[PDB]
Amino acid sequence: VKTGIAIGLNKGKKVTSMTPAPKISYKKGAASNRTKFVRSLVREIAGLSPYERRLIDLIRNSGEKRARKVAKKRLGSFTRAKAKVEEMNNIIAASR
């Protein structure tokens, strides 16, 4: 909430408020039941890629840190490496 001055943590002039509506191009990419089903089945068919096969071995042997590093290098970024390693951890904990 505003303060009514030109500086500070919450600066600016006070207007009443409105919460107009939730837009539908904000819940984009959210997982639907169809997407979940299709993607689970396609994983069951196609299986693993070679770097994923390496990752599942290296999490068991080497720990998650080497997995995060090599996944950051094979992919682009650490943000994606984290999620890939979490995916592989879940695959391992499920199949095992």
Add this chain to the structure above:
Amino acid sequence: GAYKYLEELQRKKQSDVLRFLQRVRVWEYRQKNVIHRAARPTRPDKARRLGYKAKQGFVIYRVRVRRGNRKRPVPKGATYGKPTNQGVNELKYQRSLRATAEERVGRRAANLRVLNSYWVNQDSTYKYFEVILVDPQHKAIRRDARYNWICDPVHKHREARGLTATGKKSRGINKGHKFNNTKAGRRKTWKRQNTLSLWRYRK
């Protein structure tokens, strides 16, 4: 629907089934010619979303393009100027191979208009694209108002002028502070702002 499964499966390119299919189809395409008519799309979902419709007047051409950098065809690699140009095998050809393929296919089929194109396969030597084309003399497309715009004459050699998606990307046409030098045309903006505007009553 099956197109969703096709999409999610074609995203998994390094799996065994897809690398097998790749290894077979690349050999087939390499035994065939460089440009050749495809009876049907290898990728119906991709063609469908790019604008193909399984009816008369929609055409698919498979095309092959050599890979690598651009070489300047001066005799004996000599440029006859300042040395700062660069090593000669390190030039990159701002237009993409997809655009090259589109333009060669449109030159072979000049009666058709190039709607779009998409990657199918590649090798060390060659890349492979499927190009979607339209017949504007066909009555089914002269009618059917969703595609009667391709029949107007401002859509001649879209691929040669850079109006397909790869052309827009290679020109750098998008909105933002990043595409400031090329948003309405690089040369247009250059001619606009390297221009001395002088009014009657001088400012």
Add this chain to the structure above:
Amino acid sequence: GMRYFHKQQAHFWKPVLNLDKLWTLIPEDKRDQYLKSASKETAPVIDTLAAGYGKILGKGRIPNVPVIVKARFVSKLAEEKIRAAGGVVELIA
């Protein structure tokens, strides 16, 4: 010196108005009556932002009449000089 990438001169828009003028913003019709009527219960409010002024400064003397000044920024001496006459400074955004 140091650098500033993507400088834009709207973050820095902050024109100044010394205390000496401070009644030009009141129209002439109204000015002389408010001067003679040094009423503390009823004083003329001066919006400086609508006039196009961000900060107020204290270069000179005003009379001892009350006045309500609305501004985003002020100086210590300006607030002092207005409070002397018996005017408050209301802050805005």
Add this chain to the structure above:
Amino acid sequence: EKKERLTKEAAAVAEGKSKQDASPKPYAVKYGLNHVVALIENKKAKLVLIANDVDPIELVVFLPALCKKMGVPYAIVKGKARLGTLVNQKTSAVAALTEVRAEDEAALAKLVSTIDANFADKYDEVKKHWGGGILGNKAQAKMDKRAK
């Protein structure tokens, strides 16, 4: 048949007293790929036939696993033209059947049991066990002689 059904419908409904009672409930095969994949995931299908020969095999590679998961009796049939024959097309690439007359319910059930026992229960292992390690006859003779 559609034309005669339509003229009979117009004759009975437009002038007479009925709405859809003219043409009865029809029973037929379902033959569209998307339509059949949508019939599955609602579990209306009692039988599915999948052509072995399809251009883009990726159109159909997912179908057996999907039928298994949703609990459908599938079969892989030799010939898509053989399906086009029974559905008045040149090709179909699938065929399905979700309901039948009572006269044929028992035949359908026996056929599904036959298909299960002969196709799936015989080939349930096939998700493993790669194929295609065969050689030409000259290379085979070379290997044989080098072995012995």
Add this chain to the structure above:
Amino acid sequence: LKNHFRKHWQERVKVHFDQAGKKVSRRNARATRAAKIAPRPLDLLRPVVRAPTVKYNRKVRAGRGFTLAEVKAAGLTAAYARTIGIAVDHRRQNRNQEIFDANVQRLKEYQSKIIVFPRNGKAPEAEQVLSAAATFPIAQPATDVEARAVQDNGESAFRTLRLARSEKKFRGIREKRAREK
């Protein structure tokens, strides 16, 4: 001290002799559009909106189009509004009740002032007005009255601004201290 004339600038020189003729052709185009559009204004009703950019937020200003919430509150639909002569902007969102009510009353006044002809026929003659912008001008809202009672409390706004600045500057340090607690 910096004159950019090392290029072939003499090729790219535009002199605006065409000023007057362009003005004339613009006027003629407006007249022809008016004849083609005869009973209607040549301008769509635009809303009032508050400008961004602190330099300009004091001012209110004319926008592109009304919101769908404003249109529904007024009590008609977007398509019918676009046919009636109202601009609509699907991407503007309403976070201010003042602006909301202002544009709602704008739409109400427009609806009351206009006269719509039926599709079938009559078409009574109406003596066009050319400027909805002039008919429904933008109004700067009134902040406060001219004169008012003084009320002083003794916190000296200078010190108030200084304390705001200081808490903004030293927020994070105190948070990390209370974390270490």
Add this chain to the structure above:
RNA sequence: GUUUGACCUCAAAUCAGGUAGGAGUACCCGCUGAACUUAAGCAUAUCAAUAAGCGGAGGAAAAGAAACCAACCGGGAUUGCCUUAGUAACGGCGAGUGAAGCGGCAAAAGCUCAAAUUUGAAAUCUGGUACCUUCGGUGCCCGAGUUGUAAUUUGGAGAGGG
């Protein structure tokens, strides 16, 4: 049945009907790409993202209804003008180069597909042919098409059931 056919793929015809080329190229869309000159001589640099060369269109072209600007009490497709500004910034920090948001204005216009089972009825479409009131309509017959043609839906929303 070592027969008779269906499909797929690839061909042929002076097959029926159409279509591309070339010219012009002031303006427009891309590609490719110098040096003279100016910097002391000069490799960076500048001349210049220019000239020459190539491909491709129209009466305008291109762009265009946000994977935008912003940090405001928030604005709201694109294009062009005034201004922002010879500024922020770049540079042997030298010669020199060099934008953009905001604001005022001109003109104003919004929309479409894929991804959804019609599944109680491929409802869709080209061509051939006979008539007609012929920039087309009706009927009939080959065909395209279920490896998906119509209606319905496009994120601002929207659909199904009630």
Add this chain to the structure above:
RNA sequence: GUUCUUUGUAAAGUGCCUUCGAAGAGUCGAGUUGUUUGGGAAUGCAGCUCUAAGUGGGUGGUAAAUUCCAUCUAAAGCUAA
């Protein structure tokens, strides 16, 4: 204006509840090379290699890690002044 045809009980708009709400991949993105830009620990493009996700993704003009926030919805398309 004046007739011709009322097409249709065929399409469209609107209120409340309920279950849903599919949204584009050798693509985004990252590394390197060349080129370009005012774009500065790298503005755009192209070539080679690597290669994703779905409460996700892009941007937020100082390179990273951590916690938040704001704003849009790409990789398909048409359109007068």
